[PDB]
């Protein structure tokens, strides 16, 4: 039970997928915004696709990643809803998430910018590596892109 | 190119397997000890089974851990061989791994400390949640285990 923003869109080797359901309760605490201020939960759905150039098999979720969103109402007059996601483990899988409140129902476009391991902007940059010998090495990261959709969102 | 150390052990709906293989050249620099000054590189795999409890599907990489080994020569009558091993991605997919420096060849024991996500102990506990509301939430993590196995190390 979730509701899709869009459809997904392919990039250097990895699906990536916007969707949204209603808001949750996380451990560690104080992380999220309180479900009862929010109204969803946003979710980036990152897995890899065939002949990953990262080393990643088919139909793995790509950790380690730090996403940041972008929501903007279209024709509101209010300014554009900000966010980081936080990596996390839900019934569905590990995914990248995060309780967000909107600006009422409507129209709005969802941009997702998405940091390899070893952005400057990636706080787990020191925690991931990636072999680079010939033998059993990966191609290096990719570089971080942004991937935008349109939603009309009605209240859930 | 991976060398089995005893067989894989299965608990809390994870299998884990201890490896070893020739060391390595990883990014970024300076975390991993120089390729030319070990003897291997040891790696812990440690996947999903079937009706995880955490949420992850079956086959999944359990991400997020911290492991802990420590390596004693059998009648080495030298003191044990310590570390911390770092999440990181090869060609056959994301592990946690190390270079170490052994005492020459002969039988070794390893024992592999597998601390789960929340661990005071895991460095990376402020960056992986785990949903815990009725309608998405999983089980609790897994409490700190230990596993040990031995090996005869003569050389790669
Ligand atoms: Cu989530
Ligand atoms: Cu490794
Ligand atoms: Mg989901
Ligand atoms: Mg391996």
Same mark, same amino acid.
């Given at each position: 039970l979730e509701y899709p923003i869009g !459809?997904?869109?392919n990039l250097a080797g990895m699906e990536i997928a916007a969707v949204y359901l209603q808001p949750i309760d996380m451990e560690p605490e104080g992380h999220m915004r309180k479900a009862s201020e929010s109204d969803i939960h946003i979710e980036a759905d990152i897995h890899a696709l065939s002949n990953?150039?990262? &080393?990643?098999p088919?139909?793995?979720?790509?950790?380690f990643l730090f996403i940041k969103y972008e929501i903007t109402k279209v024709g509101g007059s &209010? +300014?554009?809803? !900000?966010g980081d996601m936080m990596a996390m483990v839900a019934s569905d899988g590990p995914h990248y998430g995060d309780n967000v409140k909107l600006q009422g129902p409507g129209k709005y476009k969802v941009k997702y910018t998405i940091y390899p391991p070893? +952005?400057?902007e990636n706080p787990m940059s020191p925690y991931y590596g990636r072999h680079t010998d010939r033998e059993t090495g990966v191609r290096p990261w990719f570089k971080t892109f942004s991937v935008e959709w349109d939603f009309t969102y009605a209240g859930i």
């Amino acid at each position: 039970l979730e509701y899709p923003i869009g !459809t997904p869109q392919n990039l250097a080797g990895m699906e990536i997928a916007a969707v949204y359901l209603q808001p949750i309760d996380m451990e560690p605490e104080g992380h999220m915004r309180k479900a009862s201020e929010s109204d969803i939960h946003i979710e980036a759905d990152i897995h890899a696709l065939s002949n990953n150039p990262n &080393g990643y098999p088919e139909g793995f979720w790509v950790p380690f990643l730090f996403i940041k969103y972008e929501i903007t109402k279209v024709g509101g007059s &209010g +300014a554009p809803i !900000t966010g980081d996601m936080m990596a996390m483990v839900a019934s569905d899988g590990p995914h990248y998430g995060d309780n967000v409140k909107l600006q009422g129902p409507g129209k709005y476009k969802v941009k997702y910018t998405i940091y390899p391991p070893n +952005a400057k902007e990636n706080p787990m940059s020191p925690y991931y590596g990636r072999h680079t010998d010939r033998e059993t090495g990966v191609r290096p990261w990719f570089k971080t892109f942004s991937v935008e959709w349109d939603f009309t969102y009605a209240g859930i």
